[model samples]
Target chain A: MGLEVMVGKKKGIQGHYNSSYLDSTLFCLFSFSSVLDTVLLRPRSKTDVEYYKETQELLRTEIVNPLRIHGYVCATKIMKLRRILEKVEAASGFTSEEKDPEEFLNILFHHILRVDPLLRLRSAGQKVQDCYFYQIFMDKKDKVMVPTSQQLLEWSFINSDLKFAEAPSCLIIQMPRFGKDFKMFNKIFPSLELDITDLLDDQQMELFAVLCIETSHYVAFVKYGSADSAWLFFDSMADRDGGQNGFNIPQVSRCPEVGEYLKMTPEELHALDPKNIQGYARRLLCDAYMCMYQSPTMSLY
Target chain B: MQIFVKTLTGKTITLEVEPSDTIENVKAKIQDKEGIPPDQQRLIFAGKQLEDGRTLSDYNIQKESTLHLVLRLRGGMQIFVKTLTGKTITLEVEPSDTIENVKAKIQDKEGIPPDQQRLIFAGKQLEDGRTLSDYNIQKESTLHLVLR
Candidate 1:
């Protein structure tokens, strides 16, 4: 239903060309149509054979046809390119499955990994442990020392996304993105309908969903964050409470997004700029709470 | 040159041929057996593609080399897969937490009862009573959350 009218058949390119305008149109149509069916028909009614047959037809005609067209073009180019090759094998040569599946996976992986322009703030349940923070110190020589394992786990957010002031001893992590089908309108609307038992037994899915929702809340934070902040923010999540009395992150403590404003030195806060300092900190606190959908708390600093 | 072929699941096949076999010919031969689209096919040399059939001699298509012929995914495979399975969320969590602790946490988050929910990590199901140690609660791990 969306952007379908804009597609116009255009002619000719010597190299790679895409007719995605048409493809997107078809995808949306099928997706939303399924959504409409669910809204209008009974869940049982929606699963009728006649409806599936019609949907499959539309899939082939609008979706697969366009895909096959590009496939043909790419094949032609591949063949043309091959003519220049000195060594050529015949198409009839028979081989086993081992010969080509690796390439298949690589291509799929490359396709998924290209650019990675949009990263969901939500991580899969598996990657939660990669984030953690530990303490280190600068020596007289300005060198560094390794943090103890206990110290590192206590302070790091490597696996956890949320770092609450007072954390409940136990937590449930969720990955929200995995809850819905992001691929198309059909999957998005009616849902995959797979039984939870079919995927991850009862316990694992709970961990997945919890972590997803928690992580997505801060995914946007990572985008505008500085180079090291993602690592810093994520890594620090491991520290459930200020396990140690204090940890130092010199410049970042006063960062804009993290609820610091009017960052006056103790002298500045005491002397001429106290009001300005109070005003700035108040505003920063307000903004941070608002982002979290929380009512403003009394000023802590 | 002899290039080894492999499946998506990593089963290796031995194909002995001269240095003259173009990637297209190899793909066509494999396509006949695999049913994967020839055009949608891609060839990888040491996990990289050749510079468009500049020839085995042009690149390093030597004897006894292993090349990968992978399936092509473009346009909207993600959209399709998402339609099929929903989203994949990888959670990075502490290794010390038990699977039951994670389950209760997710139950709280989704407002679902933990007793009724199912959780999967790396394609394996975990029990609620099991400690995170019972299942490998490694750091940087991913768990799958699916609704039944």
Candidate 2:
């Protein structure tokens, strides 16, 4: 009922593309991969727009388009010459698409070798978890104080003495979700203007995009400008009026629930009943899976 | 109110505006100078995209402060369509575009009649009057188009 005004009339794209036998090309999987390409690969110049457009078209045709048509997408992992014998195997098996951003990224960069490695973090006097994304963790407590993105980073870095030896242009922070069944908090706070001044060893990074998963479905909320900038919420299989296809999906403006939750104090938020909150609001509260931060120092877009 | 606007191209333009002026007013002023349409201008201040109806004072936009202006790419989103025959075609459409809009485009290119068109995504048939985003269609997403 509230979907109409909450969502703008503009229909960006229709995402009802099925992934049953067409399993591998599911919107959940392809969205992340496509987002990574759109956010990072696009060059930031008038002349380069065509270059970016052509490349994305190529990406759609070669990878995404085919996967939508075929059930599975194939990729050959690059291996060291000496390890070729061990690596000569058929394509990998399809794990349930429900996976942490770290796993998704490892497959994207180090596995499919689509994008280059973008992060390098040092932990406890040693370099470890050399990957594109970093996952945050919190122990389960009956009455847990949901941590802010900044607080989570500070705690993780101090606890492990983890430091970024090199400041990355982009940083992806993954919230803790216990597999696909459970989440650590009823609601985790999104630090709107995340000040990574001290946490990153560091670059002045700002929120760029957030990818949220609701068990089986995945949606993304991308900030077009800055913290207070306009934002868009995207879902793969959303519906619209007329039932049968006039301008199918809709994009919502600033999410009111997200803004409301962000304004409340931790004490107040923890005191509320999770069951009372509407599904749309609760989705923003508990479903966040990945948050992307971009450096202003290197303004690519 | 007088404000400075910084464009993506690194040029800054100064504008003298009234406190009651809407964000659209600012966009119009920029268009006269930059040749960019008001609809295409994304005027950002303090990280927020100024809403069309809001006045300058609502955002507390002050003199000497800078506004970031970005021009969105031209209209139309690119989507992929896979035929039942396993052939894929890329079509460009607008946010306001409909299933009929796509069928017409397909007709122009593939000579298929709108009545004969059946578009499927995620295993469900697409209806005619709704916008693409209503179905959660995104760039690069594939819809299975078939002959009814």
Candidate 3:
């Protein structure tokens, strides 16, 4: 119902968030829930609705393995969504095997975005002429700045010259936290208002999902549905029993309980981190990798 | 002390009044020159709308403090009259004037006699010798004109 729960032991679908064949390599698989969440959160707009459906689409075509090219051996080749996704990863020209352990967010974005669609297409039965998300550069040692989305977004733009060319269909922001050169804190200030004005921007781009990954783990929290939506946590490695026939099911838990975490200050969050439940206690802000935001303009019917 | 009042349109009106002058005194001088009624003028200064009873010194008024003023149109009214041919006719009428006076104004503009003009509003025929105020005619109200 929500992306096929393809598990291990391989007679068929062979992929897992905690990939054990040769160490974990699919944080993108878990982190990508943020991208898909943005598509479903907004009220249906002509421009944005079909985006998710098209990206998940699989078309039949021949693969280039000459052994399958026969007259009557019952020949047909080409399968697996993971195969298309791998081509994008290889096509991405990035080299982050294990030496760069924390590069999965952007690496995942490279695979997700590159394989999906460059610019979002138009709603006229048809498309942005540019990339979906933009890289943010903020002033350092102000440094390892721990603040609100307002302060973070402001400081990044106020310290630079780039402005949006037009209304963005979606604004996916990858934090500057994981570079080979950076260290802010155990957690950052929670940013409620994606309240960006003069950032030539209308209006408000609401925060619908936060994808957090740290060290070797990946999971996401997405605000799903419309108007009456609530927060939900997604961890792909969450499964019933392990190994052999253990299908890696994406564990989804309704987590409005995380609201108490947002109610406190970042300093207080750090003070309480040692005793609190790890992953999402301070991690929603601290381990934040990619924050997906959206505009209703793209979906206006 | 000399102070400036910037209108909503950003035009400035420079006036001289003592720091001891109440906000009421300046409205008279403003009314004298600008022809805007004192009661209708709203002077905003230092983020406070100046009250008639409040003094300039009470608001810390000094030389050249740029206050802002806004005015509203009232007492008289302007109504648009649309003729049967869908032509335009503008009438400036006071609440005290009868609907009959309005017909004369329309005659001046359209060359139609008062006897032949029929003014209809809210599906009610406007009878002569009755003030538009009696019919609850509002400012910017548009009336239909049918000819006999």
Worst 10 residues of 1 chain A by lDDT: A203-212
Q: Candidate 1 on A95-162: residue-level lDDT in tens?
A: 11111211221221222112111112211332211111111111112211222212222222322221
Give lDDT tens digits, candidate 3, residues A72-135. Answer: 0001111233334345555421221121222333333333433333233121221222344543
Per-residue accuracy of model 2 over B47-142 as CA lDDT, tens digit each:
244668788887767788777665532334446677766665656555567888778878855678988999988788988988788888764467
Per-candidate TM equals 0.23, 0.47, 0.43
Pairwise DockQ winner, candidates 1 and 3 = 1
Residue B143 lDDT, candidate 2, scale 0-100:
81
For model 3 the TM-score comes to 0.43
Can you give the DockQ of every candidate in the order shown? Answer: 0.01, 0.01, 0.00
lDDT (10s digit) by residue, model 2, range A1-301 = 1223324433222333221111112233342233355433544454342234443444456445543344223321111211221232223222211223343344334433335556777655554345566656433343347777777766646644677767776777767554334565668777765665575453467666677765444566655533343455655334332323432342344554555566787777668876665435565567787777766522344
TM-score of 2: 0.47
The per-model lDDT (C-alpha) reads 0.29, 0.55, 0.50
DockQ of 1: 0.01
* DockQ, prediction 2: 0.01
Q: Fnat for model 3?
A: 0.00
Q: Compute the lDDT of residue B63 as modeled in candidate 3.
A: 98
Clashes of 3: 4
Interface RMSD to the true structure, each candidate: 22.1, 16.5, 32.4
